[PDB]
Design a protein around this ligand. Structure first.
Ligand SMILES: C[C@H](CS)C(=O)N1CCC[C@H]1C(=O)O
Ligand SMILES: C[C@H](CS)C(=O)N1CCC[C@H]1C(=O)O
Ligand SMILES: C[C@H](CS)C(=O)N1CCC[C@H]1C(=O)O
Ligand SMILES: [Cl-]
Ligand SMILES: [Cl-]
Ligand SMILES: [Cl-]
Ligand SMILES: [Cl-]
Ligand SMILES: [Cl-]
Ligand SMILES: [Cl-]
Ligand SMILES: [Cl-]
Ligand SMILES: [Cl-]
Ligand SMILES: [Cl-]
Ligand SMILES: [Cl-]
Ligand code: NA
Ligand code: NA
Ligand code: NA
Ligand code: NA
Ligand code: NA
Ligand code: NA
Ligand SMILES: [Zn+2]
Ligand SMILES: [Zn+2]
Ligand SMILES: [Zn+2]
Ligand SMILES: [Zn+2]
Ligand SMILES: [Zn+2]
Ligand SMILES: [Zn+2]
Lengths: 219, 219, 219
C-alpha cells in the first residue's frame, strides 16, 4: 500500500514535501521536494511522483500556508521530479526547467516545463525567486541541478545527493559516473554556509551526506 | 445572420455548447462541444468557431455553473474545434491536444494547444480529467480523437461521427476514406456502454449514428 | 542611481509605463510601453527593462486601475521590450509576439512569448484586443511591429520611432537602414488619424516625430 504525502517544516518559510511510490521488489520509496514561501505566494521545488500527489501539495500551500504556488523548478527529467507536471499546469503553476531537462523529459514521455532556465555550462548559476540555482555538472543525471535557499541556508541536492550512510548509488543507468563526485564537490564549494542538506530519497541531514555521496560515487 | 451560442444539458454535470457560422452557399452550420463539471471547476471539449463564441462559453461555465473552465481538449485541427484557442489562452484555460493535432494546427494558421496528449498509435487511450480519450485511427481527419464520459456514458464523436441519417460526408479534403469506417468501429467497440453519441454538426443522438456513419463512409 | 518607474495617462483607458536603466557612459535611459484598459481587465504593450520594473507595472494595473493585466504584446526582441518576460509569465500574463520576435529573443537569451502573432509579411495587420497590430517592415529591427489604439487614436511606435528632434538613430547594429524610412511611412499611412505618437525612448509627441524619424533615417 502506497504511503500518503507528508509535509515537514525545515526552516522559516521552507517546507519539505514527500510522496511515496511502491516499486517492486523493495516496496515504498520516498521522494522529497520543497515549498518555499515568497511573501503572499510560494514556489515549488519538484513535483512528487504523480499528478494526484502533486495536486495535494498545491492544495496544501493554498489552504494551509495561504500562499498559493505560483511557479516551480524541476531538478532533473525523472518521474519523481516531473511526474506531476500535468497537475501543475492545470493548477496554474508556471513551471521552469533547463532546456536539457525539457528535452530529456519529452524523450521519456514526461511533460516539459513551460519556461527555460538558461544554465547549461558547468558551474553556471542563476537567481530565481530568491533561490540560487546551480548546474554542478553531470552526476546522478547529466541534467541534474541543485537549489540553495540562502536565508535558512538549506541546500536541496535532489537525487544527486544519496541518503544517509548508504553505499548504494540508486539507478545509475544514465548517471555520469566519471563526474558525479566532482559535481558534489562543486555544489559543496558553491554553498559552504548550508548546514541542512536535502536528498530526494532519504531524510534531511547535514553536510556529512555531501561528503559521503562524494566518497561512494568517487572514481 | 449568424445564430447565437446555445447550452443544453446532456447528463449530470455534462453540457453541450453549440456555436454557429454562416458558410455560403448553405448558410448557418452548427458545431458542438462539451463542458464537463469536475468538482469546483470544469473542463472543456473543443472551442466553438471563434474567440467571441468561445469566450461566451468560458463565461457561462464561470457564471452559471460556478465551475470555471480550468483546462480543455481539442479533437482535431479544424477551426470549429480550435478556432477559439486565443480566447482560451487569454482566459487562463490550460489547453491539450495531440502532437499531430498541434502540428496540423500550426500549418493551418490555427493556434496549437499548450500541452501534448501522448496518444499517437491507433487504439491508444489515456485518462484525462475523468474522461477516456481514444485515438481510433484516421477518419474525418488523420488526427481525430474521441472522448468518452463514463459516468453518464456519453461518447463525444466530434466530426468523425456524421449527423442523423445523412449520406453526406462533409468536407473530406483531408479525410482518411480508407480507414474511417474502421475508426468508427474502433470507437464503438471501445465504449460499448455509451448510448448518447454527440456529433459536431448535428443533434445529439444514440448509437444509430455510429452505425450510420460507419455505413456511409465504408469502402 | 536608477530612476523609478512612472505611470502617465495618455487617453481614456490608455496609460504609459516608463522604466529606467543606467547605461554607461550616458546614464539613465527611459523605455516606454502601454497599459490599455479592456472592460474588467487590461492588456500590456511591452515589458520594462527587467522583472522588478515589470512586476511593478502589473501590480499597478491590479491595484490602481482595478483591471489586472491579462495579456501582453511585445514590439521587438530587445531587453527594453522583453526584459521582464519571466515576471509576466509568473504573474499569469498571457504573452504574444511574432514568430520572428520569439526566434530572435531565444537567440539573445531573452524569454520568448507564449503565443505567436501571425503577421510576417510587410504590411500585414491583425486585430488584437481592440488594437491594430501592424508589421511595417524592418526598421529599428527586422522584427519591429507597431500598435495602434483607435479609440483615442494613439500610435505606439516603440523603438522604430526616434524621440523629439534628435538626429541620432540609437543602436543600429541590427537595424534595416535601407527600409526604415519606408517602414515609418508605412505606419504613418496605415494610421492617419493618430495624432498621439509614442516612442520608446523619449516623450509622447505628435506626428512630427514620425516625419522627423523618416527624415533622419532616410537614404
Ligand atoms: C525513478 C527514480 C528517479 S531518480 C529512480 O531511478 N529511483 C527510484 C528511487 C531511487 C531510484 C532507484 O532506482 O533507486
Ligand atoms: C470547417 C469544418 C471542419 S470539420 C468543415 O469542414 N465543415 C463545416 C461544417 C461541416 C464541414 C463541411 O464542410 O460540411
Ligand atoms: C537596449 C536598447 C534596445 S532598443 C538599445 O539598443 N538602446 C538603449 C536605449 C536606446 C538604444 C540605444 O543604444 O541608444
Ligand atoms: Cl495521479
Ligand atoms: Cl523516470
Ligand atoms: Cl536517510
Ligand atoms: Cl471572434
Ligand atoms: Cl478549418
Ligand atoms: Cl505555455
Ligand atoms: Cl441531426
Ligand atoms: Cl529584476
Ligand atoms: Cl537587448
Ligand atoms: Cl523626447
Ligand atoms: Na503526471
Ligand atoms: Na545565507
Ligand atoms: Na481565434
Ligand atoms: Na459507465
Ligand atoms: Na527578466
Ligand atoms: Na479612431
Ligand atoms: Zn533521477
Ligand atoms: Zn530520484
Ligand atoms: Zn474537421
Ligand atoms: Zn467539424
Ligand atoms: Zn530595440
Ligand atoms: Zn529600445
Amino acid at each position: 500500500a502506497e504511503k500518503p504525502v507528508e509535509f515537514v517544516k525545515l526552516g522559516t518559510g521552507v517546507w519539505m514535501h514527500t510522496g511515496y511510490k511502491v516499486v517492486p521488489p523493495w516496496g515504498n520509496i520516498r521522494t522529497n521536494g520543497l515549498i518555499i514561501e515568497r511573501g503572499d505566494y510560494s514556489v515549488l521545488v519538484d513535483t512528487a511522483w504523480n499528478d494526484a500527489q502533486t495536486a495535494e501539495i498545491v492544495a496544501w500551500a493554498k489552504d494551509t500556508l495561504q500562499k498559493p504556488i505560483r511557479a516551480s523548478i524541476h531538478t532533473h527529467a525523472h518521474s519523481d521530479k516531473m511526474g506531476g507536471m500535468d497537475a501543475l499546469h492545470m493548477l496554474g503553476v508556471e513551471t521552469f526547467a533547463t532546456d536539457l531537462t525539457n528535452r530529456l523529459a519529452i524523450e521519456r514521455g514526461l511533460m516539459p516545463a513551460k519556461n527555460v532556465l538558461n544554465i547549461s555550462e558547468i558551474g553556471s548559476q542563476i537567481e530565481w525567486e530568491g533561490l540560487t540555482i546551480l548546474y554542478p555538472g553531470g552526476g546522478h543525471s547529466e541534467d541534474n541541478i541543485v537549489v540553495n535557499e540562502g536565508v535558512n541556508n538549506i541546500l536541496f541536492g535532489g537525487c544527486m545527493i544519496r541518503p544517509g550512510m548508504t553505499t548504494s548509488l540508486g539507478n545509475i543507468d544514465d548517471a555520469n559516473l566519471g563526474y558525479w563526485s566532482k559535481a558534489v564537490e562543486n555544489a559543496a564549494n558553491a554553498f559552504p554556509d548550508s548546514q541542512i542538506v536535502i536528498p530526494s530519497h532519504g531524510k534531511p541531514a547535514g553536510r556529512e551526506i555531501l561528503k559521503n555521496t562524494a566518497y561512494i560515487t568517487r572514481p
